Design a protein around this ligand. Structure first.
Ligand SMILES: [Zn+2]
Ligand SMILES: [Zn+2]
Ligand SMILES: [Zn+2]
Ligand SMILES: [Zn+2]
Ligand SMILES: [Zn+2]
Ligand SMILES: [Zn+2]
Ligand SMILES: [Zn+2]
Ligand SMILES: [Zn+2]
Lengths: 145, 145
């Protein structure tokens, strides 16, 4: 499973013009579910994402994770992260997850976030969305399990 | 060299609220310079970025590159991409180039983009930047050479 995370000052997802998910400071998590993922992997990824020390302390050093910073998490499914982009001008998608299993793992990841007492927001699993955000830094990390 | 690209309807970079670069439809390119990168790597990555077929055609199918779609490119320096996120809650930048080298190759990459007659806007190297964007889809790809 892949989590391409961006530290944000704000982020929102609109589906058909209406806001379906919106947060202030925190993380925008683009989640890519892979063919062989399971809850165990989703769990470890969630753990790593929420514990990643990339938020400024009361003095300016990155020593705090999103929970300590009091930030939120906006999770959006991104099938393109699991793409094979090794060669050529066209991505190939075969390492991606199946139809249903993908949503199940996505929902699971989101629920695990909420279970960690995180103010969590989402976008409809496979809907065409416009994700607005302000990447603060910028700070962007590729996490994968 | 790494380019984490996001398909956008608009994007802009500000430093303390001041715009340094701004584009409409196109690609936001977060650039990560690696330790042994050189001009040849930059040349190749530029070619892949400007040629990646991730824009919709007439039939709304992902088949055109940013040049064909008539889009623009906003390049922003991003050190965190070359980080090793294998274990621990703290990133390790052992594969990332030093500040001076990263800047030199970032500037070179930007100039290369411009030479391809591509409307190229940028952030400001080493500056604390707020990158505002609207990821259309969303569509996000990790490209590397
Ligand atoms: Zn619509
Ligand atoms: Zn569901
Ligand atoms: Zn719950
Ligand atoms: Zn101004
Ligand atoms: Zn080396
Ligand atoms: Zn210097
Ligand atoms: Zn420079
Ligand atoms: Zn020039």
């Amino acid at each position: 499973m892949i989590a391409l995370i961006q530290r944000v000052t704000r982020a929102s997802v609109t589906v058909e013009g209406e806001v379906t998910g919106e947060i202030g400071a925190g993380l925008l998590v683009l989640l890519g579910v892979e063919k062989d993922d399971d809850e165990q992997k989703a769990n470890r990824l969630c753990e790593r994402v929420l514990g990643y020390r990339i938020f400024s302390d009361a003095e300016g050093k990155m020593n705090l994770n999103v929970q300590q910073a009091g930030g939120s998490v906006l999770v959006v499914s991104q099938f393109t992260l699991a793409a094979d982009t090794e060669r050529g001008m066209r991505p190939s998608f075969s390492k991606g997850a199946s139809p249903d299993r993908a949503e199940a793992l996505y929902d699971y990841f989101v629920e695990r976030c909420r279970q960690q007492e995180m103010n969590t927001q989402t976008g409809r699993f496979a809907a065409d969305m416009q994700v607005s955000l302000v990447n603060d830094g910028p700070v962007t990390f590729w996490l994968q399990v």
